[PDB]
């Protein structure tokens, strides 16, 4: 509908949001499970790990 914003800018954006949807979900899968590991690591004292940077 826009004379400047063509299919070009649209497709680039659409596909981009698609990318966002994919991997943010892939994160959450691991996160929720690792989250439990986090608590388990709390008891181990591994909660922080080794962050010297």
């Amino acid at each position: 509908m826009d004379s400047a914003i063509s299919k070009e800018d649209e497709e680039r954006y659409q596909k981009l949001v698609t990318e966002n949807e994919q991997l943010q979900r892939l994160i959450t899968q691991k996160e929720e499970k690792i989250r439990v590991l986090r608590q388990r690591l709390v008891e181990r004292g591994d909660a922080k790990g080794t962050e010297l940077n």
Binding site: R12, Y13, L16, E19, N20, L23, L26, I27, K30, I34
Partner: protein
């Protein structure tokens, strides 16, 4: 980096499409971080710790 709600149409044109690609990269880097944690998940999995 101030409010973008002042020029909603203006910013969200360039600003929004821009933040999506960074999110695409940022979220991807998270998965790589998570991938190391996947190893700790595997010891959970394989050991059947539950």
């Amino acid at each position: 980096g101030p409010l973008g709600s002042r020029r909603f149409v203006v910013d969200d044109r360039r600003e929004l499409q821009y933040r999506v690609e960074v999110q695409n990269r940022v979220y991807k880097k998270e998965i790589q971080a998570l991938d190391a944690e996947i190893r700790k998940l595997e010891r959970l999995l394989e050991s059947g710790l539950t």
